[PDB]
Each structure stands twice: as structure tokens, then as C-alpha cells.
Design a protein around this ligand. Structure first.
Ligand SMILES: CO[C@@H]1O[C@H](CO[C@H]2O[C@H](CS[C@H]3O[C@H](CO)[C@@H](O)[C@H](O)[C@@H]3O)[C@@H](O)[C@H](O)[C@@H]2O)[C@@H](O)[C@H](O[C@H]2O[C@H](CO)[C@@H](O)[C@H](O)[C@@H]2O[C@@H]2O[C@H](CO)[C@@H](O)[C@H](O)[C@H]2NC(C)=O)[C@@H]1O
Ligand SMILES: [Zn+2]
Length: 1015
């Protein structure tokens, strides 16, 4: 295994180092506004060394943005694909590339068989080439790597099945900044090449000046380079035709033949395209070849890529003709005039990369190595695209909920083959596709129109229902005695109970377990643990009595705590935000212990008075002018007091101190240790009253944030043996700190209400001497070192926080883990901050044509981990990565993949069993079974199950390692007949494994395996 900690890779370009040295001055470069006037030597190309130009026609099709997926499909994309089929069929030299398989599958499945065959033929002969082949072209900032892989797999499995092709070149012209998680996943999925476009204009200029726009992109920890993937970065401001032929858009626009007027388009530089004729072709060719040769000066080979496309292009038949005929005329003239020393043709992306590597192999070029990321993007001026790290945070959180529900549904249902009448494959395909669609760079990013966000939400809601159906049918099958099992595949044997989605104040979706002497004495509940290690976690349920006790299914009592059900209300008469308790519903909490990838059953039973193994939390309401708070049968009366500082400790865990406003002020890790200052604060950013306005994409604050004026908020303290909490009703945020004996959990119910032109930030202030350094993750996969740069504006120092961030000094680290991607930074030494929501009245001039005024309450969840790290073996000062500790990694897992909770829906479960998976291996804590998916339907004689196995890297801090069991996923199901290592999409076999044993993987590596079983 490569060491991912102690060896600093040697790369030609390391983006953090480049950032430290780069000036970022925004000077007028001339016609290339963010570059310089490119010069070339005409003598560079000659008879023995021609410039080979590939013009690659393309059409950017957004799967929702300004219109919904279906609206775009009906108005634009079905016509683009129908006319592409016709025109490519009829014009054998014409070419076209296609990226978004969600639309292509949507089209192809509606084609008559003779058109399906025609389509297959133009793909087979190379005229229509798929690039990337994901369901979408995903966002790279907010997306979790697991969902990037899910959508890539959904698109590529469709293409292999129906088109018999698997792209090895990726095309990502539109995400708003780029992540090295993409080459990581793509290189492990068979790819050889990738292309990106939206990188900071200063980076484009710097890399262009060094001809470092094509590079071998390796991961930041990878010393040896086996992760490297050849990457092409486009050099100019846009992927449209004015910015793809060469550096001068006033010239290149004249070669977009859709702009002469009848199509409703024109050239902003005020020189239109002119139809090519014999009379003008020499002059037009001279202008175009000059642009090409300038672009070619920025790259190292004599093979030049010229994309030819824009959004929803190649729609009308007359557009196909006008682009094709004019370019054919240009090519005939240029190719026949030796003085240009150019051979130009339509091509595909794969054609371009193959010719580049042929030139490399011939010794014409060597390419630099690069590591790092390309966040935060700015396309011009100070317009940094950090707003979309937070926009529409309800759906950002929903993404992570559904992420987990899809994993759990696929894993729970994978253990068996299912009859087609159960509709398991149908429901899972729906769930995978709606989650995959939302990875689109206008979906999770929060950059679509309001009605499109509603369409994504509705799709994801249907996907959650599909996951629930599959999970509950699977639990019923896995825990009922086989000779009793008698399923109705349409029935709900269980309902899911989810305490954090949509979340209190977001929606009371939670069912109460109704118990009573004259109706039902007891109820079975079942917990699922998708992680491959034994796990304990407190779980809570709502019950209709406080007098409830818990047993396991050996009838062993389980210690439990009952608390009230508190809900917060904005009281429009007293003008306060305060909690109300239920007098008929209560929360019971207990520790569930669940096998690896397994299930555990418990029983809740009512009794007529306090049970022996159930305790009751106390409750203290801190406010001036209190009023009573009755709680029905709850055995402890609520206490009242004026606001005051308070401190709490659960178990042997940290002691937390709170201000009289209900906000954390310090953490004491042990009885001996110091109370370490850790202060939570809420602040607000506004919008500029002159100049460019923040919108769904851009964050353009009017200066540093200002504190939220808190008034005298009401604070509720609940103190229990198992769980305590401090909750406070602040303006726009019900803020909750929950303690269960280790790192606290923070929940914010964020309702920015009608606060126009406001962004709500949660900041942590500490004494940690972090300086200008902080760490944030990329796609939930890796943590990258960031350096705050005062030479950049505040919004440029914001980065995606897809799952966590930390600061540290020699002795102390503070890590904040998230259950949702949001934007954040460290704007001063010892701070962390993360945006909660943003409400913006204005459009920000990037095409959305609306502000962000559709906010809804969202429950954001976090874990806060303060740790001593002076004993940890950390990377050297020059290393670009950081790594979590075991506690912070487990805390992230507790947010993203909690236990699932099932409530049996009818009165008696006959045949119930107490556990599933007790004989599953409990793997080392840094290993995960990220995916388990049965790949065959029931009629296959040889069943196949795929697994994606990911090992993270945790810091060594001197905790002796607990001997654990080796996990061999190929023996998790019986009767294994073969074990293969595959690409991560499962589509190619890479190794036939000895002994049918799937090896575990190295730290920071991810591997896929498929087990085959005789059935
Ligand atoms: C119509 O207003 C202009 O259009 C441009 C913005 O709309 C353009 O792009 C839209 C985006 S679709 C695409 O990306 C979005 C994210 O933006 C994503 O969510 C979707 O999924 C898609 O993938 C689209 O709706 C339209 O088709 C259109 O292309 C924008 O380029 C332009 O801004 C330039 O022009 C104004 C003047 O009109 C200037 O004031 C700006 O400064 C900017 O000028 C450009 O600056 C760069 C850097 O200096 C130069 O190199 C360019 O040459 C220069 N262009 C021009 C015309 O001067 C407007 O907003
Ligand atoms: Zn797009």
C-alpha cells in the first residue's frame, strides 16, 4: 500500500502552491480579455508537420435548469436527438458527441425499432460518440462521490446494455469549478482521458502561459502516480463557439453559423457570420486558421481540439445544415491549400485524445503532472461562484438523505433474489435515477428555476418512497421464519421512522407508536446498520405513553430514557420563539446494537407506571416571564429560571458550557482537562447596493458578516442519563446542541423567513492557532488543505463543505462534520464558519433569471469534534492533504449513514426473528461497503452481486488497534462460484480472484468486486 501521509508527492503543478504564488491580477488582455495577445511563428507548421484540427460538434443539454427535464425533452432535446440521427445518418463525415444519458435513454426508449437500429449504427461507426456516459454531467462541489459513481454507473450501464459502448473520455464543460474526485472515480472506471472547462480565469492564464493546460491529474496524496488521468483544460471563458475557436470571440462568433439572424441569435461583437462561398472562402479561412494557430500555441502537440456547440444546439434541421455546409466548405479550402499546413475535419472527443497520445508517443510532447482542485471558480472580476455551495439547502440535505436510503435499499434487498412481482428492480431503478438526475450541475447546486426545484424535490420524494418500500419488504423477509413468510408485495409491513428528515419544524412526518391497555400492549421495532461493523447508536421513537420499556429479542431489558416531545413555535402574539410540549406523545430513547450490514429487533411495551429500566429527563426552560408547560403523564414537572449560563455532561463524555443565550462557549474533554473556548455565533451577510449582486451562483457579500441581534432568546435544557440537550429559539434558527456522551450533535432548524438579501452563517470561534490554514473535504472522499488568501476577496476564500471541515494547530483540532453540503471557510485564525441559508432578491446574471426567494425550513445536522492531536502522526507541512481521526470519521458516518429504524405496522408479527447478520464480519473501522447491489434478476442461473469497497485513511494517534475481522465480500452470500475485481461501475472484469476471495483495499483506495453464485 502507498503511504498517503508521509511522502509529499512531487508534481509539476500543485494547486495550493500555485495559489500561494499566483498574483490574481485582473488585467485587460485585449481581445482575449483574461489572457494576452497570442503570437505564433507561421513557420512552426509545414509540409512535414501539419496542425491537425478536430472540430467536435456538441450540444449542452441540461437535465432541468430553466425548464424541467421533461419540458426540455419535449421542447428541445427530442428534436436535437431526432435530427442528429437523421443528419448523421445522411452525412457520413459529420460527427456529434453526447454526454447526458438521462436524455438519451428517454429518447431511445421511445424510438421505433428501425430508428433504434439506425441509432446503433451511427454509434457503432463512430459518428455519434458518447462522452462520459453518466446519467448527467454532475456538479463536482456539493456531490458526494458515492452519488457521482451512482449516476456514472446508471448512465454507463444503460449505454453498455443498449448501445454496447463504454466511454473512456469524459467531457465536463459546465460544472462550476472542478474536483479531483472526478479523475479518481473515472480512472477506476476504465477512463483514459477527461476534459474540464470552468476554472478560474487566472488559473487558465497561468497554465496557458506554461502550456500546462493538458496535464496528468493525480490525487493530492499519490506519490507514485497510479491515480493519474490525462486531463485537458479548455483555455477560454466559455464553451460556446465564440470562445472555442481561438482567443478572439469577435472572430470566432463569425464561425457560429446559427447567428446570422433567422434563428434569433446574433454576435455581441457586432460582426455577423457570413455564409462561406467560393468568393470569400480564402479570406474566411485565413481568419479562422489564424485563430486556430493562436489557440494551438497554448498546447504542446500538433493536434487541436475545437469544440463546436452551445446550449441545446443542433436542434433545427436548418441549423445542422448551416453549420455542416459552411464548415465543409472551410475544410475543403483549408485542407487543399498547402500554405496553411492544416488538416481539419469533424471529429469526436476520443479521436482528439487518441491523436494527442499518438503525438506524445512519437516524442513530440511530454505532459506535466498536477494535483489539487479547481475551486473556487470565478469567471470574471470578483465574481466567485461560492453561493451555490449553499443555495437551496433543503434539497442539498435531501440529497444526503436519499443517498443513504438508496444505499440501504439496494443493500437490504441484495441479500435475496426477488420475484418480478415484488417490483424491487423497478423501484430501485426509479430511486437510483431520480437521485442520479439531481446530481446535475443545476440540481444539487440550487441553481434551477423554482418550478424545476419542485420537480427535483417531487422526484426525490418518489425515490424515498420507493426506497422505503424496498427496505421494509426486505426487513420483513430477512426477519421472518422462512416457512411462515407470506408476503404481499404491495403491503407496508414496516414504516420508516426518521428523526432528522424532514425534521422537526420542517415536517411532523413522524408516526407515534400507539400503545395502551385497551388497544395494544407492545410494538416491535427493527434497526438496520448498513455499515460493515457492529454499531451502537441511540435511537428514538415517539410513543403515546411515558411508561414504556424496551427489551431485546431475548427479552433482556434495555436501558431507556423518556423525554418530552418539544416543538418550537413563533408566537405571533407574544412575538417570541418558544417551545411547547406534547401532553400525549413522548420520546423514548435507547441504545440499539446492530450487527455489521445487519438488523436487530427490539420491543417497546407499555406499563401502568414508571418501568424499572426507563428514566425520565428533567427539563428547564430559561426565559424571563415564563408561563407553565404541562406535559400530561410525564412524571417530572418542567422547571423554570431566568437565562443563565449552564453546563452539561453526559456519561463520561465532554462537559459543555453554554452562554445565557443557549450557545456553546467551551468544551472540557475530561474532568482534569481545561475548558477549551469554542464559541458558536450566528451572523448575517448582506448584498451590495452598488455593483454586482449575489444570486444563486455568486456570493458577493457587502463586507464581513454582522452578528445576528439575538434579543433574550428562550432556552430549553433537557437533561437525561442517555441524552441531554440545549435548544434555543434564535431569529431564523432553532439551534440545538445534543449530547449523548461523545462529540455533540448540532441541529439547526433554519427558517430565513422573509429576510431578503440575507445569508445566515454559523461561526465557531476558538483559540486554535490555525493561522491561515483550514481543511475542507471534496465530495465526502478526501480532505484538502486550504489556505485563506487575503489577496483574494472574502467570497473566494469560501469552499464547498460537502461533509466536513477542520482547523488545527500543533495541539488541538476542531472538526465540524455535516449532514448536508454547504459553503464555508475559516476567515480568521481559530475560526470555522458554514453558511446555513441565503435569500436573495436579485438575479446574478448567469442565466437563471430569478433570485432565491423560495426558501423553506431545513434541519441541518452536524457533529462537533474537539480533539487533542499533538500525538497524531500528521502529514508534513508541505503535504496538500489532511485526514480525519477515528472519532471524526465515525461522527461523519453517524450523520450520513445512521441506523435505519422500522416500526412494525400491524399488531402482531408472526414468525419474527431477533437479528440478521450476526455472522457478518465486523471490518476495520476505516473500511466501508459503500455499495452492495445485486446485478442480476431472479431468472439468471448465475446470480451476481457487486460491491464497492472504500477504505479511508485515519490518523494514527496512539490508540491501540482492536483486532478486527477480514471482510471478504465475495463470501458474504453462499455458494460463491467466482469472484472478480471490476471497474467501479461493475462493467468490466479486471481480475479473476484466487480462492474467490476479494482482498481488502489500501487506505484511500476504492475497489469493486462482483461475486457470482450458482442459483
Ligand atoms: C445574455 O447575457 C449574457 O449571457 C452570458 C450569460 O448567459 C449566457 O450563458 C448562460 C449560461 S447557461 C450554462 O451555464 C449556466 C451557469 O451560467 C449553467 O447553470 C447551465 O447549466 C449552463 O451550463 C446562457 O443562459 C446563455 O446561453 C448565454 O450563453 C454571459 O456570457 C454574458 O456576460 C458577458 O457579457 C456581458 C455583456 O453582455 C459582460 O458585461 C460580461 O462581462 C460578460 O462578458 C464576457 O466576459 C468575458 C471575460 O471578460 C469575455 O472573455 C467575453 O468575451 C465577454 N462576453 C461578452 C459578450 O462581452 C451575459 O451575461
Ligand atoms: Zn448546464
Amino acid at each position: 500500500c502507498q503511504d498517503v501521509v508521509q511522502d509529499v508527492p512531487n508534481v509539476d503543478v500543485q494547486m495550493l502552491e500555485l495559489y500561494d504564488r499566483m498574483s490574481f491580477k485582473d488585467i485587460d488582455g485585449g481581445v482575449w480579455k483574461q489572457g494576452w495577445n497570442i503570437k505564433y511563428d507561421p513557420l512552426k507548421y509545414n509540409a512535414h508537420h501539419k496542425l491537425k484540427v478536430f472540430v467536435v460538434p456538441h450540444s449542452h443539454n441540461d437535465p432541468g435548469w430553466i425548464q424541467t427535464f421533461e419540458e426540455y425533452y419535449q421542447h428541445d432535446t427530442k428534436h436535437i436527438l431526432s435530427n442528429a440521427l437523421r443528419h448523421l445518418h445522411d452525412n457520413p463525415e459529420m460527427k456529434f458527441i453526447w454526454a447526458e444519458i438521462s436524455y438519451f435513454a428517454r429518447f431511445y426508449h421511445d424510438l421505433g425499432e428501425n430508428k433504434k437500429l439506425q441509432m446503433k449504427s451511427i454509434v457503432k461507426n463512430g459518428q455519434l460518440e458518447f462522452v462520459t456516459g453518466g446519467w448527467v454531467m454532475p456538479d463536482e462541489a456539493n456531490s458526494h462521490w458515492r452519488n457521482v459513481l451512482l449516476q456514472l454507473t446508471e448512465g454507463q450501464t444503460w449505454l453498455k446494455q443498449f448501445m454496447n459502448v463504454t466511454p473512456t473520455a469524459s467531457w465536463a464543460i459546465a460544472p462550476f469549478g472542478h474536483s479531483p474526485t472526478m479523475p479518481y472515480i473515472l480512472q477506476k472506471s476504465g477512463f483514459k482521458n477527461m476534459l474540464i472547462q470552468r476554472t478560474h480565469y487566472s488559473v487558465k492564464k497561468e497554465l496557458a502561459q506554461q502550456r500546462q493546460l493538458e496535464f496528468l491529474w493525480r490525487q493530492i496524496w499519490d506519490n507514485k502516480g497510479d491515480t493519474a488521468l490525462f486531463t485537458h483544460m479548455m483555455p477560454f471563458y466559455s464553451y460556446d463557439i465564440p470562445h472555442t475557436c481561438g482567443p478572439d470571440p469577435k472572430v470566432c462568433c463569425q464561425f457560429d453559423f446559427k447567428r446570422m439572424g433567422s434563428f434569433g441569435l446574433s454576435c455581441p461583437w457586432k460582426v455577423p457570420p457570413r455564409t462561406i462561398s467560393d468568393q470569400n472562402v480564402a479570406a474566411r479561412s485565413d481568419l479562422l486558421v489564424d485563430q486556430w494557430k493562436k489557440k494551438a500555441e497554448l498546447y504542446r502537440t500538433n493536434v487541436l481540439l475545437i469544440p463546436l456547440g452551445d446550449d441545446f444546439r443542433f436542434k433545427q434541421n436548418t441549423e445542422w445544415d448551416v453549420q455542416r455546409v459552411n464548415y465543409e466548405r472551410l475544410f475543403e479550402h483549408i485542407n487543399s491549400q498547402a500554405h496553411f499546413n492544416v488538416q481539419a475535419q469533424f471529429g469526436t472527443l476520443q479521436e482528439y485524445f487518441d491523436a494527442v497520445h499518438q503525438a506524445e508517443r512519437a516524442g513530440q510532447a511530454e505532459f506535466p503532472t498536477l494535483s489539487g482542485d479547481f475551486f473556487t471558480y470565478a469567471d470574471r472580476s470578483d465574481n466567485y461562484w461560492s453561493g451555490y455551495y449553499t443555495s437551496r439547502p433543503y434539497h442539498k440535505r435531501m440529497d444526503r438523505v436519499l443517498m443513504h436510503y438508496v444505499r440501504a435499499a439496494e443493500m437490504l434487498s441484495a441479500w435475496h433474489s426477488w420475484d418480478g412481482m415484488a417490483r424491487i428492480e423497478e423501484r430501485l431503478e426509479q430511486a437510483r435515477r431520480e437521485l442520479s438526475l439531481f446530481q446535475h450541475h443545476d440540481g444539487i447546486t440550487g441553481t434551477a428555476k423554482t418550478h424545476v426545484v419542485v420537480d427535483y424535490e417531487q422526484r426525490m420524494q418518489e425515490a424515498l418512497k420507493a426506497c422505503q418500500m424496498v427496505m421494509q419488504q426486505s426487513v420483513y423477509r430477512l426477519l421472518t421464519k422462512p416457512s411462515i413468510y407470506s408476503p404481499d408485495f404491495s403491503f407496508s409491513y414496516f414504516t420508516l421512522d426518521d428523526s432528522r428528515w424532514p425534521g422537526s419544524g420542517v415536517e411532523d412526518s413522524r408516526t407515534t407508536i400507539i400503545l395502551g391497555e385497551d388497544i395494544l400492549p407492545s410494538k416491535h421495532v427493527v434497526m438496520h446498520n448498513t455499515l460493515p461493523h457492529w454499531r451502537e447508536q441511540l435511537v428514538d421513537f415517539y410513543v403515546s405513553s411515558p411508561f414504556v420499556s424496551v427489551t431485546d429479542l431475548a427479552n433482556n431489558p434495555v436501558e431507556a430514557q423518556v423525554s418530552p416531545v418539544w416543538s418550537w413555535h413563533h408566537d405571533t402574539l407574544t412575538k417570541t420563539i418558544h417551545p411547547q410540549g406534547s401532553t400525549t406523545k413522548y420520546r423514548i430513547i435507547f441504545k440499539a446494537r446492530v450487527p455489521p450490514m445487519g438488523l436487530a429487533t427490539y420491543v417497546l411495551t407499555i406499563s401502568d407506571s414508571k418501568p424499572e429500566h426507563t428514566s425520565y429527563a428533567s427539563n428547564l426552560l430559561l426565559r424571563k416571564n415564563p408561563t407553565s408547560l404541562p406535559l400530561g403523564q410525564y412524571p417530572e414537572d418542567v422547571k423554570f429560571g431566568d437565562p443563565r449560563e449552564i453546563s452539561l455532561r453526559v456519561g463520561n463524555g465532554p462537559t459543555l458550557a453554554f452562554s445565557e443565550q443557549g450557545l456553546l462557549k467551551s468544551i472540557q474533554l475530561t474532568q482534569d482537562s481545561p475548558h477549551v473556548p469554542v464559541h458558536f455565533k450566528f451572523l448575517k451577510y448582506g448584498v451590495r447596493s452598488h455593483g454586482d449582486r449575489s444570486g444563486a451562483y455568486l456570493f458577493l457579500p457587502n463586507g464581513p458578516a454582522s452578528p445576528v441581534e439575538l434579543g433574550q432568546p428562550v432556552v430549553l435544557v433537557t437533561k437525561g442519563k442517555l441524552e441531554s440537550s440545549v435548544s434555543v429559539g434564535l431569529p431564523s434558527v432553532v439551534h440545538q446542541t445534543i449530547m449523548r456522551g461523545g462529540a455533540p450533535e448540532i441541529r439547526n432548524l433554519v427558517d430565513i423567513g422573509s429576510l431578503d438579501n440575507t445569508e445566515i452563517v454559523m461561526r465557531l470561534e476558538t483559540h486554535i492557532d490555525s493561522g491561515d490554514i483550514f481543511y475542507t473535504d471534496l465530495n465526502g472522499l478526501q480532505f484538502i488543505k486550504r489556505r485563506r488568501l487575503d489577496k483574494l476577496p472574502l467570497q473566494a476564500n469560501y469552499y464547498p463543505i460537502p461533509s466536513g471541515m477542520f482547523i488545527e494547530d500543533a495541539n488541538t483540532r476542531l472538526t465540524l462534520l455535516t449532514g448536508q453540503p454547504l459553503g464555508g471557510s475559516s476567515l480568521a485564525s481559530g475560526e470555522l464558519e458554514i453558511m446555513q441559508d441565503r435569500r436573495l432578491a436579485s438575479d446574478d446574471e448567469r442565466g437563471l433569471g430569478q433570485g432565491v426567494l423560495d426558501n423553506k425550513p431545513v434541519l441541518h445536522i452536524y457533529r462537533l469534534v474537539l480533539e487533542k492531536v499533538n500525538n497524531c502522526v500528521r502529514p508534513s507541512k508541505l503535504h496538500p492533504a489532511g485526514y480525519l481521526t477515528s472519532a471524526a470519521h465515525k461522527a461523519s458516518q453517524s450523520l450520513l449513514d445512521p441506523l435505519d429504524k422500522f416500526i412494525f405496522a400491524e399488531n402482531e408479527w408472526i414468525g419474527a426473528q431477533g437479528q440478521f447478520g450476526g455472522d457478518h464480519p465486523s471490518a476495520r473501522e476505516d473500511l466501508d461497503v459503500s455499495v452492495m447491489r445485486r446485478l442480476t434478476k431472479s431468472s439468471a442461473k448465475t446470480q451476481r452481486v457487486g460491491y464497492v469497497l472504500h477504505r479511508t485513511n485515519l490518523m494514527q494517534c496512539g490508540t491501540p488497534e482492536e483486532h478486527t475481522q477480514k471482510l471478504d465480500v465475495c463470501h458474504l452470500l453462499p455458494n460463491v462460484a467466482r469472484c472478480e475485481r471490476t471497474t467501479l461501475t461493475f462493467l468490466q472484469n479486471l481480475e479473476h480472484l484466487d480462492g474467490m476471495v476479494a482482498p481488502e483495499v489500501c487506505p484511500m483506495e476504492t475497489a469493486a468486486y462482483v461475486s457470482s453464485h450458482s442459483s
